[PDB]
Amino acid sequence: QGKITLYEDRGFQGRHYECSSDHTNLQPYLSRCNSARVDSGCWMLYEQPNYSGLQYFLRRGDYADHQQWMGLSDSVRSCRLIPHSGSHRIRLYEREDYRGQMIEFTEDCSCLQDRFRFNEIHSLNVLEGSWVLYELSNYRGRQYLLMPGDYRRYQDWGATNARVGSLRRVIDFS
């Protein structure tokens, strides 16, 4: 299991709270959360409560500022713990309902354009080892979490589109 420490203020100060399980409302404990520390496991922070807004992928390490975990927007009133770390297999599909060209990955892909021509995914099948799609390559944009399941559209993970640049697998071992 994962275990992080979130601090209402940066540099790990002010009020602090340790979460070892999925949460939908941290407002009562944290009013901001400008920094975080991940001891183990992969955690995701949501700008909105009940995971209803933007998400930030966090991994084992120390973050003294939000902008470090890709915090595009301060705040953060909820957080979830990402399960799965065994095998990592996923089958991205061009069109919805697993239609059109398909490609399967089993590791990190910094540059999809090298493995899959299409620059967007409108569906995918995650068998194991949750994944994290990135709008662009070199992981420097938006990020979406794909838990183990069956996706037939991009709206499943609440996305503005399908545009995909890269993808990684979530590991709690590291």
Residues 6+ apart with CB under 8 A from 113: 119, 137, 165
Q: Which residues of 71-93 are buried (b: 16+ CB within 10 A; e: fewer)?
A: beeebbbbbbbbebbeebbbebb
169, β-bridge pairs: 131
Deposited experimental method: NMR
The bridge status of strand 42-46 relative to strand 166-169 is unpaired
Amino acid at 25: N
Is 40 in contact with 2 (CB distance < 8 Å)?
A: yes
Listed residue (112, 120, 111, 117) closest to 162, CA to CA: 120
**What superfamily would CATH give domain 85-174?**
Crystallins (2.60.20.10)
User: Facing residues of 7 across strands?
Assistant: 16, 35
Domain extent listing, the chain:
1-84, 85-174
Fold that domain 1-84 belongs to in CATH:
Gamma-B Crystallin; domain 1 (2.60.20)
Enumerate residues 6+ apart whose C-beta is below 8 A from 12.
Answer: 5, 35, 37, 62, 64
